[PDB]
Each structure stands twice: as C-alpha cells, then as structure tokens.
Amino acid sequence: VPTKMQVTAPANISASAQTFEVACDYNGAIATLSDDGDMVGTAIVKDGKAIIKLNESIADETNLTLTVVGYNKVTVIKDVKVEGKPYTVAVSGKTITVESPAAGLTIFDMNGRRVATAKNRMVFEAQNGVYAVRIATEGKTYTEKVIVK
C-alpha cells in the first residue's frame, strides 16, 4: 500500500512561462507538465522543490496536467490553466493572418515570447519557426500552432 505525499503548485501558468515550481515533501518524486502525451517538461524534487524547465513554449495550450510520481507514493495530479470554430489562422510563406470577429488575438514565438496582439484581424510577418496563436473570444480562448518555413 503506497503512502500520500504533499504537493503544492500554482493553479495557473503564463502562456509565456519558462519554468514552473512545484513544492513536494517527498524528495526524489518526479514532477512533469503535459498536454496529454506532449510531455512539456519534467524535474526531480530535491530539497522539497522541483523547478520544471519547460522544453517548449506552452503558449499553444489552454491547460496542462501536472503529474507528480514517487516510489511507493500515490501519484498526485493537478490541472493548470495557461493564460495569455469562430476564427481562421492562415499561413502563407512568412506571413500568418489571423481573423476572428470581436476577439483578442495574440501570437507567441517558439521561446514563449509574445510577438503580436491585435483585435479582430492581424497580419503577422514571421520568421522561420513555430508559433502559437491565441484567439480569446467571450467565454472561450482557442489556440493553433503554426509552422512557418
């Protein structure tokens, strides 16, 4: 029969974040952030903390799952909200065109840095790489991930 461990972590994470700190009272436990199957980062608990260094931008996520696993411990799971149909995200070479009536549009680069903010419509002039696009309507945020060659 496994025992319990104590885990405390924020309820939210910035779309631009680079790390995520989890307190846990079992040294050697493993804390991991994921979007079911995309493993976005992992750290071992040492001195009561795991500082998860994210391996990719999470700006294309609305939620992530925190999982903390330990030898003979009951696994602890938490949802974490990531905070920056009725739209289109278009790519054409180096330009990304985003449209959605009455929406906040945001674009983030592959280092999680926010590169563009506009209302309703924008054209963004990109560089080679992967971007996240956030379209924030009333009641709901959507995201897409765009590859620019």
Author numbering: 579 to 662, 672 to 736
Question: Which of the paper's sentences describe this entry?
Answer:
The virulence of P. gingivalis is dependent on secreted cysteine proteases called gingipains (RgpA, RgpB, and Kgp) that are essential for corruption of the host immune system and acquisition of nutrients and heme – a vital growth factor and source of black pigmentation of colonies on blood agar. Gingipains are synthesized with a typical N-terminal signal peptide targeting them to the Sec translocon and are exported through the OM via a novel secretion system referred to as “Por Secretion System; PorSS” or following the naming convention, Type IX Secretion System (T9SS)7. Translocation of gingipains from the periplasm across the OM is dependent on a conserved C-terminal domain (CTD), which appears to be important for secretion of the proteins and in particular, truncation of the last few C-terminal residues of this domain leads to accumulation of gingipains in the periplasm. Here, we show for the first time that the OM translocation signal, a conserved CTD of RgpB, has a typical Ig-like fold encompassing seven antiparallel β-strands organized in two β-sheets that are packed against each other in a β-sandwich.
However, diffraction quality crystals were obtained using mutants of the same construct, which included an inserted hexahistidine after residues S664 or I665 (recombinant products r664i6H and r665i6H, respectively), or by substitution of six consecutive linker residues (I665ADVAN670) with a factor Xa cleavage motif (IEGRAA; r665sXa). The three structures were solved and refined with diffraction data to 1.9 Å, 2.4 Å, and 2.1 Å resolution, respectively. Each variant of rIgSF-CTD formed nearly identical crystal structures (RMSD of 0.760 Å for r665i6H and 0.327 Å for r665sXa, with respect to r664i6H for 298 aligned residues). In each tandem, the IgSF and CTD domains showed an orthogonal arrangement, with their longest axes tilted by 90 degrees with respect to each other. The 9-residue linker (T663-D671) between the immunoglobulin-like subdomain and the CTD did not yield visible electron density, indicating that this fragment was disordered in the crystals. The lack of cleavage observed within the linker by elastase is clearly not due to inaccessibility of this loop to proteolytic enzymes, as proteins bearing the IEGRAA motif by insertion/substitution were efficiently cleaved at the Arg-Ala peptide bond by fXa. Interestingly, however, there was a clear difference in the kinetics of cleavage events, with r662iXa being far more susceptible to proteolysis than r665sXa. Taken together, these results demonstrate that insertion and substitution within the connecting linker do not affect domain structure or inter-domain arrangement, and suggest that the linker is resistant to proteolysis despite the presence of peptide bonds potentially susceptible to cleavage by HNE and PPE.
